[PDB]
Enzyme design. Structure first.
Site, PDB file in Angstrom:
ATOM      1  N   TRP A   1     -42.694  32.310 -20.873  1.00  0.00           N
ATOM      2  CA  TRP A   1     -42.116  31.109 -21.428  1.00  0.00           C
ATOM      3  C   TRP A   1     -43.208  30.048 -21.507  1.00  0.00           C
ATOM      4  O   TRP A   1     -43.214  29.058 -20.776  1.00  0.00           O
ATOM      5  CB  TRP A   1     -40.987  30.650 -20.527  1.00  0.00           C
ATOM      6  CG  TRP A   1     -40.111  31.775 -20.094  1.00  0.00           C
ATOM      7  CD1 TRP A   1     -40.141  32.424 -18.892  1.00  0.00           C
ATOM      8  CD2 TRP A   1     -39.060  32.392 -20.857  1.00  0.00           C
ATOM      9  NE1 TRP A   1     -39.168  33.400 -18.857  1.00  0.00           N
ATOM     10  CE2 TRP A   1     -38.493  33.398 -20.050  1.00  0.00           C
ATOM     11  CE3 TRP A   1     -38.543  32.187 -22.141  1.00  0.00           C
ATOM     12  CZ2 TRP A   1     -37.442  34.194 -20.486  1.00  0.00           C
ATOM     13  CZ3 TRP A   1     -37.499  32.990 -22.569  1.00  0.00           C
ATOM     14  CH2 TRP A   1     -36.960  33.973 -21.745  1.00  0.00           C
TER      15      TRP A   1
ATOM     16  N   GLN B   1     -22.822  27.168 -38.114  1.00  0.00           N
ATOM     17  CA  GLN B   1     -21.802  27.953 -37.382  1.00  0.00           C
ATOM     18  C   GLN B   1     -20.623  27.138 -36.840  1.00  0.00           C
ATOM     19  O   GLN B   1     -20.531  26.840 -35.652  1.00  0.00           O
ATOM     20  CB  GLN B   1     -22.424  28.789 -36.242  1.00  0.00           C
ATOM     21  CG  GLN B   1     -22.870  30.193 -36.621  1.00  0.00           C
ATOM     22  CD  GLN B   1     -21.744  31.199 -36.608  1.00  0.00           C
ATOM     23  OE1 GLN B   1     -21.083  31.399 -35.589  1.00  0.00           O
ATOM     24  NE2 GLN B   1     -21.523  31.848 -37.740  1.00  0.00           N
ATOM     25  N   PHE B   2     -19.700  26.822 -37.728  1.00  0.00           N
ATOM     26  CA  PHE B   2     -18.501  26.078 -37.362  1.00  0.00           C
ATOM     27  C   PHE B   2     -17.743  26.697 -36.192  1.00  0.00           C
ATOM     28  O   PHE B   2     -17.051  25.984 -35.448  1.00  0.00           O
ATOM     29  CB  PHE B   2     -17.567  25.978 -38.570  1.00  0.00           C
ATOM     30  CG  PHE B   2     -17.023  27.310 -39.052  1.00  0.00           C
ATOM     31  CD1 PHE B   2     -15.718  27.682 -38.764  1.00  0.00           C
ATOM     32  CD2 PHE B   2     -17.807  28.172 -39.830  1.00  0.00           C
ATOM     33  CE1 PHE B   2     -15.204  28.886 -39.235  1.00  0.00           C
ATOM     34  CE2 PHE B   2     -17.305  29.382 -40.297  1.00  0.00           C
ATOM     35  CZ  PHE B   2     -16.000  29.736 -40.005  1.00  0.00           C
ATOM     36  N   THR B   3     -17.886  28.012 -36.038  1.00  0.00           N
ATOM     37  CA  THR B   3     -17.167  28.780 -35.022  1.00  0.00           C
ATOM     38  C   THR B   3     -17.601  28.524 -33.563  1.00  0.00           C
ATOM     39  O   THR B   3     -16.956  28.992 -32.627  1.00  0.00           O
ATOM     40  CB  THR B   3     -17.316  30.282 -35.299  1.00  0.00           C
ATOM     41  OG1 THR B   3     -18.505  30.796 -34.672  1.00  0.00           O
ATOM     42  CG2 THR B   3     -17.439  30.517 -36.766  1.00  0.00           C
TER      43      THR B   3
END
Lengths: 151, 152
Positions: free
Chosen positions: A63, A79-81
């Site tokens: 990282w 991504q409305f979900t």
């Protein structure tokens, strides 16, 4: 704003007998959902993060490197979900997600700011609120999740 | 526990050059992060949602059929980076996820419940603890997020 970040080796976004419109190689695919109350401040964060989360290794470190460091690319995808509550029944409802019209303009402001920060050959997108098929190649996989309201 | 869920028309997971070891075709792909203090009560909230969320469209109706109603598979994967922490600096902080061994056995414990609750043959895993390489035909896409610590 909400985002699901997934480290990847490529991705081929396609729309309907089915055709490709976007393809990244190494980099991020970002499942980004706007909330009915997101401000530019919110997005501003999600960008900062997507562009700077050091999610790659650079031999003898973990990282350590981020999308830009290694000249990789992002595929941003609405991504409305992600606000779809699932607590209620075993069916979801996406009322939390911003109204799916102005939201689009927010999104374009996003993609636009994204490019003003990275270069603009590195930012890819799908077809807002259109059934898409995405062949992602997950590398790891790494799957980071931010929720700007959490802060 | 936290889980990214993705509706898929298929998935191909591999490990180490690479070797395919799992593969679904129509169903879900769940990225499960096990939390340091996860009680079995948390593990049941995922499996019920994964198994019962109506994420499939049919016959002039949206959000109607769950994975079971269709006999679809479920490819499940331990995903600990879901407990990455990016509030401080740019190098995530994974200090809140359950630890590997006590996560592994927890994982298996959760895989089984899945099995008991649907069917053995409909459920694949990856390879806990190993670098994997999963090709995912996202269908929609459709990503749902759940966090057990966010509820009652």
């Amino acid at each position: 704003m909400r985002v699901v970040i997934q480290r990847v080796k490529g991705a081929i976004l396609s729309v309907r007998e089915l055709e490709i419109i976007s393809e990244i190689k190494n980099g991020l695919i970002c499942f980004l959902g706007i909330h009915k109350n997101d401000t530019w401040e919110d997005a501003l964060y999600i960008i900062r993060k997507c562009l700077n989360l050091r999610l790659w290794n650079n031999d003898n470190k973990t990282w350590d490197k981020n999308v830009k460091d290694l000249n990789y690319e992002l595929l941003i995808v609405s991504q409305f979900t992600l606000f779809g509550n699932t607590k209620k029944g075993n069916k979801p409802d996406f009322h939390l997600a911003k109204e799916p019209n102005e939201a689009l303009i927010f999104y374009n402001k996003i993609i636009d700011e994204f490019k003003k920060q990275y270069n603009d050959d590195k930012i890819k997108i799908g077809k807002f609120g259109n059934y898409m098929n995405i062949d992602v190649t997950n590398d790891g996989p790494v799957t980071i999740y931010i929720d700007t309201h959490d802060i």
